[PDB]
């Protein structure tokens, strides 16, 4: 299927795995990060004895399979799910073995050392891979953006990373990760819908309402004013049609769901909102480059697909920062895949072909030394 000896770019982002060959502009195999395990034991004869579903095979059946998240906040919980999702991506979709081409994986900023050593060991010992490389997502996203300056805000599913890069220079001391993202928003919407009257307590419905949020939920331009005008609703409340057919009616809750990002007090945490944390990060940077960080801020992550985030960011930053300079916020189209796109354009360089880590040096050095070599 592939006639070019190039690394397979597999972005294992929290919530959605995006795998594809280098050189492509979009991932071909896109599936959620979920593992379905048979809950009961059947006396039936003939069905697949497979004890571990994955991807679309699990999405197609969520009532029988108990759903487990292979990644939580960033820390890898179960490694069997890791081996399952890579083995599946290798021998069920791409139809190619890892013994013929490299593999450029993308990991989140500020992750545990155990996670890195574990994935590297599974990719070297178990699977025969000629060479591995771990890369931070923020750099590849800035590559795909086509710039060298700005602060990347990557909001995945269970973690949110703010990474400032000015003139290409990474700042490992200022990268601050906060576990507020799509899962805590799904939980907030679920508890407020339970407050509305429709109560559910199973994961399949949780994924359904997550999809409903992805499709409908947006960000408000003025929270309190929308609350007041929605008190007497007319066009502000919408009636959604569940894929099963049950008629759901959702009004203001939509534009109050992502608001939890701006007010973490809703989930009883002393952490500051994403905008205030980004602002504090900007103060932690130097003054000289602060204006450039204001003018080149970039966004990444699937959570940014909601309509109305750019305007909300502009008003909040204008209210926090002075209103004398110019603070333009740029969001490139299809930003979610941009990271992966970067991977593709990063795997075609010959120099990058010279910066890989082969098996033998890793085996003698050991995983810890490999951690030192990368950084």
């Amino acid at each position: 299927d592939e006639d070019e000896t190039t690394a397979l770019v597999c972005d294992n982002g929290s919530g959605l795995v995006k795998a594809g060959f280098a050189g492509d502009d979009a991932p071909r195999a896109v599936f959620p990060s979920i593992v379905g395990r048979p809950r009961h034991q059947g006396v039936m004869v003939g069905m697949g004895q497979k004890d571990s579903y994955v991807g679309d095979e699990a999405q197609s059946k969520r009532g029988i399979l108990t759903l487990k998240y292979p990644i939580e906040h960033g820390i890898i919980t179960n490694w069997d799910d890791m081996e399952k999702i890579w083995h599946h991506t290798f021998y069920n979709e791409l139809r190619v073995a890892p013994e013929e081409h490299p593999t450029l994986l993308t990991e989140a900023p500020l992750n545990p050392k155990a996670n890195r050593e574990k994935m590297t060991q599974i990719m070297f010992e178990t699977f025969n891979v000629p060479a591995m490389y771990v890369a931070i997502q923020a750099v590849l996203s800035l590559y795909a953006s086509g710039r060298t300056t700005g602060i990347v805000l990557d909001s995945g599913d269970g973690v949110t990373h703010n990474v400032p890069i000015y003139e290409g220079y990474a700042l490992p001391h200022a990268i601050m990760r906060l576990d507020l993202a799509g899962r805590d928003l799904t939980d907030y919407l679920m508890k407020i819908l339970t407050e509305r009257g429709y109560s559910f307590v199973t994961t399949a419905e949780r994924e359904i309402v997550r999809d409903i949020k992805e499709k409908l939920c947006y960000v408000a331009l003025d929270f309190e004013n929308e609350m007041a005008t929605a008190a007497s609703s007319s066009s502000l409340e919408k009636s959604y049609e569940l894929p099963d057919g049950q008629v759901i009616t959702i009004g203001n809750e939509r534009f109050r769901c992502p608001e939890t990002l701006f007010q973490p007090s809703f989930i009883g945490m002393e952490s500051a909102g994403i905008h205030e944390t980004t602002y504090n990060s900007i103060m932690k940077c130097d003054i000289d480059i602060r204006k450039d960080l204001y003018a080149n801020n970039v966004m990444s992550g699937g959570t940014t697909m909601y309509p109305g985030i750019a305007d909300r960011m502009q008003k909040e930053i204008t209210a926090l920062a002075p209103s004398t300079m110019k603070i333009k916020i740029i969001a490139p189209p299809e930003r979610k895949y941009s990271v992966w796109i970067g991977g593709s354009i990063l795997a075609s360089l010959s120099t990058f072909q010279q910066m890989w880590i082969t098996k033998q040096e890793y085996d003698e050095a050991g995983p810890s030394i490999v951690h030192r070599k990368c950084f």
């Binding site: 050189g23 492509d24 502009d25 979009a26 086509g146 796109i341 593709s344 354009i345």
Partner: peptide
């Protein structure tokens, strides 16, 4: 920064899937 479009599906596979036996020269 440029790229080659990937929705440009390969003609051989596309020609087989659209025609069947009629695709012989392409």
């Amino acid at each position: 920064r440029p790229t080659l479009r990937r929705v440009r599906i390969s003609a051989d596979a596309m020609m087989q899937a659209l025609l069947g036996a009629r695709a012989k020269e392409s």
